[PDB]
Design a protein around this ligand. Structure first.
Ligand code: DTP
Ligand code: DTP
Ligand code: MG
Ligand code: MG
Lengths: 692, 692
């Protein structure tokens, strides 16, 4: 206090990376870094206005905040809230969560020399923004975000309410039809989306294979690679401001003739002009492929060219599994053959050397998918999963028929914090509303097919973070039967409330998502799954928690009751949850990324002027370390295990990474994937091999 | 005859490449190759129908010819012509002109096993096609083409009237505005155009320089290179059917900040990702730049970014020359500086090692340009030169305002053959009509801005071939004062008739090209140039020729008379002539490519199953070899000289190549270019260094 010492919060931070003769960490040194931070850097560079009122005036007047948002409430309420917010007694819990938010989130002055916002402000404008002028909502979003219960996606949190601003949404999925126009559109769409920082993934699977015909003259199509090449260069050119390298991804169906040339753009010892250095790869794999590789058979690759001709649909749209045999019989459909086993072999080697081919288990997916149509691709994070539909052009690239593409608006709940306010239902409801708002205000001008999609589907991505964090606090162990029990039941109870909320919006707004009638929501089967049993706290400790919390587990009475509202009223969103990884927000929200064990006790980031910055995990103390085992230490099985439990309920997907030791073998990898597959998992993200 | 010997017309052809103890060529061995050709390969594989009538029926019925063309005339006339044609007694003059036309032009059966057309047929359908049902026209085009007087562009000759067919036009010029949309459009437009074999050149000059701002935040634009990269990959991907490698070109103004990074994509000892292997480069150079380099000064490169901001126009549109000083004064316009001398130095080294940077003498050009607006770029052959105008987009790439871009439809006259039918005026008129037709029927769907352009401008490219051929026949010598005299007067007389014809169409059709009123055609100055004198056969031999031909040289009476019709009636075409090189047609038409000395006595091509194919030049005999000196032997001056003479009259441009010995020095080159510049030349094509 008064005339204190040690103002190096970077050093203080560092202390978090020392072990005492007894293998304990000085957690407190971190806390000190915070104090020092604010003390020596936050406050002195934070602008302080006479009153809130004068503050906005200024912020509006010099074009920082957007007067358009404020204009939907009576200024006094806009003043009451800024006050509520600042009086809720929020502190940051870590020297980085603070450091993160002020070096990358909080609004600064155009000249970069002064902070103009603090968390509450940010929370506030976000709330105001999404609330769209509905005051009680606005309040609640404020509350939920301040408590730590909710955490909207970065794009949103970062931009809501500012004047100079990006858009509120950031990952995108486009499809490509088999013709020049659709291609030019793709290349274009990439340019436009990327210029504004978006992640875009394209579906290559419909493109005619290398060696296919064009205008009826044999051996002419040149495959997909020269198209990756373009997307590639597009992305590399139209990076976002303040970054080199955009972020693109492509997915190709595994039974597609170019699949090998496809994987081959990643094998380092290669050729030139055939080398893709910044696209992410994803492979879709149907079950048969496993069945094949199992009996060491031959995979048959079918021509999209031919398929289209003979079936009136594009490769990307038919059901390979259900038509494998039929297809091998149709002599009007050319076939090539490769050794499944050698395929998965190739797959794994690449994953080993570069982390990728994302994997999307086509069959598991479509089969659990409550929505009409098939799902043929995924996001750059492999967690979005939704039907899409083809778009058609006029010779001049003008659309003649606008299909539907997928944009994705996410946010997450910090499990811990939710389990802590007995009023779970409110928590879920708000979030859903919040998220839905993101959608409603979204209107991507430059890719008509995306805008159409959103508008039609109102699709959102409610997701979760902090699983480990929680379990740990409650002294349960990642992976444990208890854990499993917990995660199943929780995602169980969350799901009940979101459908319920979406059921509500449906009613409130007089409409539903397009195509609802065809859904499994319309005819009720969606619920069959919840009408049997299984919904009974296996472990004692788990039943416990839920009570010491006041959370009531949805009961057959509730489901049966919910099922009738839907069939009578429908829901507003075509898709509720999705569990992405949780980038740097986590550090702000103080969580453990997503639902997967903690990558380290003291996480280290290559950031800031010191070189690095250390992040101790939530609730962790010298008296509980033994509940913090690395994901590496926990290992694949356990992770694959948790995510499944979450999969019987999540209607989209969950980014799942497997952590392996640097001595793992492709077979090792390969097994894991199999476990994953047999186990229900919808998709697989990355395989990380531990490294420095 | 009856039971003859030696049927190897490839061998016979070869004999053309032997010199006898006295340095004479057996020209006759070639003629024999022809006879053998037809004898052993043409006829036996040429389909012969019972009558013409049954023939079309078939050809229509199996979808070879296009019934739509025939449907505009009474079948009997369509029968009368096929007859006229076949009775005009046309033979080919060379074993390759035949060989060329049947291996690349004449219609064959879908399965490639039989010829279905012969020249006359082809001439005929072309005539029919262009004639658009006007019978006397149709006849004439037939006549002119059969005589050798006219030779429409390859795309046209090749496709007119067929069912399965490409378009009738093939080089294209697009501009790019400084913003993502315009860029995506460019990349797209490239894709679409190229897929159908088009040559496209883009104007890069408006793009913001490497290091310019974006959304107001310093140092961010990444220049033009990543855009060349895209175009590059586009072209490489969407080659035409039966070819690898599309054909793209870019032009950049020499006073543009990226000019050096620009040339640098061609210096072989380079880096990767910055290496452009299939785009053609073109540089625009205004006069000052010479003035600069002369007094070894400093070139100042101005920011397009800034220019736009301060002048409300894009770099690509202002007059650098006229605003050089003004610009260096405006501190609101950033400047970089480079050593002019070192610039031209760089230029030449590249040209030396790779033939390019085309050069377009901005100033000469705009200054001679009779049409409103500036000209800022050129074609992949550097001979088209026309005003263009910016296009504007809506966020979705939909045009909100369609500008004008340039497409180009050419054809040429074989000088010789023209000088041979005293009725020059008919010859010119037809051609113009023929060409105009190409335009009228043209409607490029996929790049709105091109279609708009054409429709507005009706711009055509009448051009010439066989200059050497002629002069030689008449024992004049390439380059000679006589020659010069001849080429000036001829292009002089041709010009009179085309304006006249365009003046006629104007009247016949009740309209003119858009913007005519602003032209120098409207106010008459166009003619001032022809109202003084100069128009008087300097050489005696030249006056001679024109008489022994019956050609009357336009007289001050005619010009004065023509000038009044225009000011009263206007013209239909915004642009009449352009003298491109003459690819493989020449060999068919039997000419010397364009107006520039013959690249060899016996030209050799890497074509056909033998390896090569030998092409002896027109009118050449053992008793006149001394009138056939290589372009290498003639040398730059002389060539630069001829082309000028042609430039006081050609309203667009003339592809000019300089042939140099393999010991020439960049200074050597550099001088030539200067001569060219001081001499009026509008643009410079390639520099060829003799090689094997
Ligand atoms: N000209 C081309 N050059 C390179 N690739 C091409 C070309 N044309 C088509 N492709 C590839 C890209 C698409 O996957 C597919 C279809 O393109 P598209 O324009 O629809 O062809 P098309 O209609 O002319 O031929 P088709 O009759 O075979 O469909 O062909
Ligand atoms: N996001 C980007 N990434 C890479 N290059 C870009 C990006 N945005 C623009 N450029 C370059 C390409 C064009 O030459 C030029 C203008 O693009 P454009 O979309 O018109 O920019 P802008 O309107 O957002 O910014 P400005 O306000 O500076 O014009 O900027
Ligand atoms: Mg097609
Ligand atoms: Mg702009």
């Amino acid at each position: 206090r008064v005339m204190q010492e040690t103002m190096d919060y970077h050093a203080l931070n560092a202390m978090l990376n020392l072990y005492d003769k007894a293998g304990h960490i000085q957690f407190d040194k971190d806390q000190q870094a915070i104090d020092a931070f604010f003390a020596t850097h936050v406050r002195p560079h934070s602008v302080t206005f006479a009153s809130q009122h004068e503050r906005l005036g200024t912020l509006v007047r010099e074009g920082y905040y957007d007067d358009a948002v404020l204009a939907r409430y009576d200024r006094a309420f806009v003043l009451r809230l800024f006050e509520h917010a600042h009086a809720s007694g929020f502190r940051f819990q870590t020297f980085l969560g603070a450091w993160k938010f002020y070096t990358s989130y909080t609004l600064k002055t155009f000249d970069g020399k002064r902070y103009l916002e603090h968390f509450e402000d940010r929370v506030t404008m976000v709330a105001l923004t999404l609330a769209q002028g509905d005051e009680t909502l606005a309040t609640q979003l404020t509350d939920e975000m301040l408590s730590g219960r909710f955490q909207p996606a970065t794009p949103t949190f970062l931009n809501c309410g500012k004047q100079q601003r990006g858009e509120l949404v950031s990952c995108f999925l486009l499809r490509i039809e088999d013709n020049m126009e659709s291609i030019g559109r793709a290349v274009n769409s990439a340019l436009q989306l990327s210029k504004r920082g978006g992640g875009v993934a394209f579906l290559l699977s419909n493109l005619r294979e290398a060696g296919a015909p064009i205008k009826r003259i044999e051996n002419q199509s040149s495959g997909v690679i020269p198209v990756m090449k373009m997307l590639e260069d597009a992305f590399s050119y139209a990076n976002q401001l303040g970054a080199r390298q955009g972020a693109g991804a492509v997915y190709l169906h595994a039974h597609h003739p170019d699949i090998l040339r496809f994987l081959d753009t990643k094998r380092e010892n290669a050729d030139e002009k055939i080398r893709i250095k910044t696209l992410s790869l994803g492979v879709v794999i149907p079950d048969i492929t496993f069945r094949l590789a199992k009996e060491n058979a031959q995979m048959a690759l079918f021509s999209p060219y031919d398929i289209q001709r003979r079936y009136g649909k594009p490769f990307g749209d038919i059901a390979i599994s259900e038509r494998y045999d039929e297809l091998i019989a149709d002599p009007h459909v050319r076939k090539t053959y490769i050794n499944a086993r050698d395929f998965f072999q190739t797959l794994a080697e690449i994953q080993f050397e570069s982390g990728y081919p994302y994997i999307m288990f086509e069959d598991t997916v479509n089969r659990a998918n409550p929505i009409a149509g098939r799902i043929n691709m995924s996001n750059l994070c492999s967690e979005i999963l939704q039907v899409n539909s083809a778009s058609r052009y006029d010779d001049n690239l003008d659309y003649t028929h606008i299909g539907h593409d997928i944009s994705c608006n996410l946010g997450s709940l910090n499990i811990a914090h939710v389990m802590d306010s007995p009023d779970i239902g409110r928590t879920v409801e708000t979030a859903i509303r919040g998220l839905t708002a993101v959608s409603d205000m979204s209107h991507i001008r430059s890719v008509p097919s995306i805008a159409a999609g959103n508008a039609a589907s109102h699709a959102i991505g409610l997701g979760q973070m902090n699983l480990h964090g929680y379990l740990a606090r409650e002294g349960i162990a990642y992976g444990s039967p208890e854990a499993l029990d917990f995660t199943n039941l929780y995602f169980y109870t969350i799901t009940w409330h979101a459908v319920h909320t979406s059921m509500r919006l449906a009613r409130e707004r007089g409409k539903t998502f397009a195509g609802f009638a065809q859904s499994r929501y319309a005819s009720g089967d969606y619920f069959t799954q919840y009408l049997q049993d299984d919904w009974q706290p296996k472990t004692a400790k788990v039943r416990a928690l839920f009570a010491r919390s006041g959370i009531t587990l949805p009961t057959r009475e509730m489901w049966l009751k919910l099922r009738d509202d839907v069939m009578r009223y429908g829901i507003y969103n075509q898709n509720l949850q999705a569990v992405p990884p949780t980038g740097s927000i986590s550090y702000i929200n103080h969580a453990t990324s997503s639902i997967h064990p903690i990558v380290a006790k003291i996480e280290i980031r290559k950031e800031g002027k010191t070189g690095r910055v250390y992040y101790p995990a939530p609730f962790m103390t010298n008296e509980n370390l033994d509940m913090y085992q690395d994901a590496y230490d926990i290992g694949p099985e356990k992770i694959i295990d948790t995510y499944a439990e979450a999969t019987r309920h999540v209607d989209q997907g969950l980014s799942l990474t497997l952590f392996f030791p640097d001595t793992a073998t492709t077979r090792d990898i390969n097994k894991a994937q199999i476990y994953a597959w047999r186990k229900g998992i919808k998709s697989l993200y990355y395989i990380r091999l531990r490294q420095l």
